[PDB]
A paper describes a structure:
β-lactamases inactivate β-lactam antibiotics leading to drug resistance. The widespread CTX-M-14 and CTX-M-15 β-lactamases have an 83% sequence identity. In this study, we show that BLIP weakly inhibits CTX-M-14 but potently inhibits CTX-M-15.
Upon BLIP interacting with the 103-106 loop, the hydrogen bond network of Asn106 observed in the apo enzyme is disrupted and the peptide backbone between Asn104 and Tyr105 is flipped 180°. The finding that the 103–106 loop is present in the CTX-M-like conformation in the apo-enzyme structure of CTX-M-15 but in the TEM-like conformation in the CTX-M-15/BLIP complex indicates the enzyme can sample both conformations.
Author numbering:
A (entry chain A): 27 to 288
B (entry chain B): 1 to 165
C-alpha cells in the first residue's frame, strides 16, 4: 500500500539515513519494497550466505560439518568471542557456522569463506541460487566499511529477501541443510533489538544482524507469525556520517510498519 | 550494578577463583558452558552484532580453579593511542614486548587476550594486543585504525593491521 510506503519514507526521513526494506509474505507471495533494488553493504548479514555455501557443499560431502579447521593467532580479527577459545586448536565447520550465525564471530566467518574458496566462491554460490546481485568481495573485518557508493560486499533488499526465502523456506538447500540453517538462525544471541523488537513477542524469528561503518545497521529474518505462513524480511539501514552510531530501533520500526495487521 | 565493564575487567586478576570473578563481574552478566566450556563469559553493552565482553579461563573445571586467561573486546579504551601505519611498519617479528610498546606507544594498546598455560608461572605466556591509532578505537562501532600484535614468551610472533594511515 501507498500508506506503508509513506510510513517507511517518513521513518527514513526522521532517521536521517537511507533505508532499504523487502518483505515477502509467503501466504500470497506479496511483497513490500522500499529502495529494494538499491545496494546496501551487507556487513554480518553475509554470514548467512557463507554458512549456506558450506551447507550446500555438505550435500556432496555429508561428513563436512564435522571436519576440523585450525585456528591460529594470525587468523584473529575483531569480534572473535568463540574462536579466541580455540586458538592453537581447532573448530569443526559446524562449530564455525554456529559461531558465525549465533555470536557473529568474524574469525568463524573468515574460515567459512576460506573453506569454500574465498569471497568470489561465496558470490559464485549466490549465482548458483539465481542471485545476480549479491557480491562478496572482502573478508572480515574490511567487508564492513560500508562506504557510500562502494558496491563491494553489497546486495539489494529484493535480492536478499528472495535468496533468504530460497534458503530457509525453499529448495536452495537439501531438507536437512535447510533445517540446520533455520535451527542456527533461531539461536542467534542478538537480534532482539532489531526486527524482533518490532514484532509481537509470540512470533518465532530466525535472524542475522549486521553492523558496520557509516552507522550501518542491518537485519535479515525468516519469521513465523502466529497462525500464519512465514514471512521473509530484510531491513538495511545506513547513515551519512562515518562514525554514526547504530540504529537498531529503525529496523524495529520498519518491521512494525510492514507487518502491521498480521 | 550494570553490565560487564572495563573497570570490572581491570579489577579481576589472574589467580582469582570463579566466584571471585563473578563477585566482581556480576553473575547476571555471565555464563558458562555451551560454546564457552568451563570458562566464564561476561557481556558488556551491545556493540556491533554482539556485545563488548570478557572471557575468563581457569586452570581447571574445579571450584578452586584460578584465572589463567583474560580476554576482552570493547571493555578497555587505549589510554593515549598514538599508533600510526609508520609505527606499525617499525614493529618487527622477534621484538620483545618492551620494544614493541616503545614503538607503537605506551598508550596505544589494550590487552585482547593474555594466557598463562603454566599459571602461576609465566613460561609459555601468550599475549594478543589490540592497538589503535588516535581515533581508531570504538567501544560500540567499527574500528577506524587498529592492529593485532601477538607474542609468545614475550616475543612478537606476528602483526596485522586494518585501516592505519
Amino acid at each position: 500500500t501507498a500508506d506503508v510506503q509513506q510510513k517507511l519514507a517518513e521513518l527514513e526521513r526522521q532517521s536521517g539515513g537511507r533505508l532499504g526494506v523487502a518483505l515477502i509474505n509467503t501466504a500470497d507471495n506479496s511483497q513490500i519494497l522500499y529502495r529494494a533494488d538499491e545496494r546496501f553493504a551487507m556487513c554480518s548479514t553475509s554470514k548467512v550466505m557463507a554458512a549456506a555455501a558450506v551447507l550446500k557443499k555438505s550435500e556432496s560431502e555429508p561428513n563436512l560439518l564435522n571436519q576440523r579447521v585450525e585456528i591460529k593467532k594470525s587468523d584473529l580479527v575483531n569480534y572473535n568471542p568463540i574462536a579466541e577459545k580455540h586458538v592453537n586448536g581447532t573448530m569443526s565447520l559446524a562449530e564455525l557456522s554456529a559461531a558465525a550465525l549465533q555470536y557473529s564471530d568474524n574469525v568463524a566467518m573468515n574460515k567459512l569463506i576460506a573453506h569454500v574458496g574465498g569471497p568470489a566462491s561465496v558470490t559464485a554460490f549466490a549465482r548458483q541460487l539465481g542471485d545476480e546481485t549479491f557480491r562478496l568481495d572482502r573478508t572480515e573485518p574490511t567487508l564492513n566499511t560500508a562506504i557510500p557508493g562502494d558496491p563491494r560486499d553489497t546486495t539489494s533488499p529484493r535480492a536478499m529477501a528472495q535468496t533468504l526465502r530460497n534458503l530457509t523456506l525453499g529448495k536452495a538447500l537439501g531438507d536437512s541443510q535447510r533445517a540446520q540453517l533455520v535451527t542456527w538462525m533461531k539461536g542467534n544471541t542478538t537480534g532482539a533489538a532489531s526486527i524482533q523488537a518490532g514484532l509481537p513477542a509470540s512470533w518465532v524469528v530466525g535472524d542475522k544482524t549486521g553492523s558496520g561503518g557509516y552507522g550501518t545497521t542491518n537485519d535479515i529474518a525468516v519469521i513465523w507469525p502466529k497462525d500464519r505462513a512465514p514471512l521473509i524480511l530484510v531491513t538495511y539501514f545506513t547513515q551519512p556520517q562515518p562514525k554514526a552510531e547504530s540504529r537498531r530501533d529503525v529496523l524495529a520500526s520498519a518491521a512494525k510498519i510492514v507487518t502491521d495487521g498480521l | 550494578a550494570g553490565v560487564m565493564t572495563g573497570a570490572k575487567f581491570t579489577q579481576i586478576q589472574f589467580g582469582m577463583t570463579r566466584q571471585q570473578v563473578l563477585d566482581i563481574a556480576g553473575a547476571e552478566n555471565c555464563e558458562t558452558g555451551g560454546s564457552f566450556g568451563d570458562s566464564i563469559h561476561c557481556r558488556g553493552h551491545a556493540a556491533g552484532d554482539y556485545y563488548a565482553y570478557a572471557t575468563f579461563g581457569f586452570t581447571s573445571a574445579a571450584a578452586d580453579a584460578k584465572v589463567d586467561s583474560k580476554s576482552q573486546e570493547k571493555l578497555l579504551a587505549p589510554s593515549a593511542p598514538t599508533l600510526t601505519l609508520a609505527k606499525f611498519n617499525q614493529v618487527t617479528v622477534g621484538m620483545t614486548r618492551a620494544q614493541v610498546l616503545a614503538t607503537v606507544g605506551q598508550g596505544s594498546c589494550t590487552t585482547w587476550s593474555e594466557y598463562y598455560p603454566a599459571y602461576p608461572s609465566t613460561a609459555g605466556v601468550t599475549l594478543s594486543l589490540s592497538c589503535f591509532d588516535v581515533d581508531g578505537y570504538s567501544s560500540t562501532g567499527f574500528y577506524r585504525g587498529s592492529a593485532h600484535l601477538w607474542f609468545t614468551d614475550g616475543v612478537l610472533q606476528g602483526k596485522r593491521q586494518w585501516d592505519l594511515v
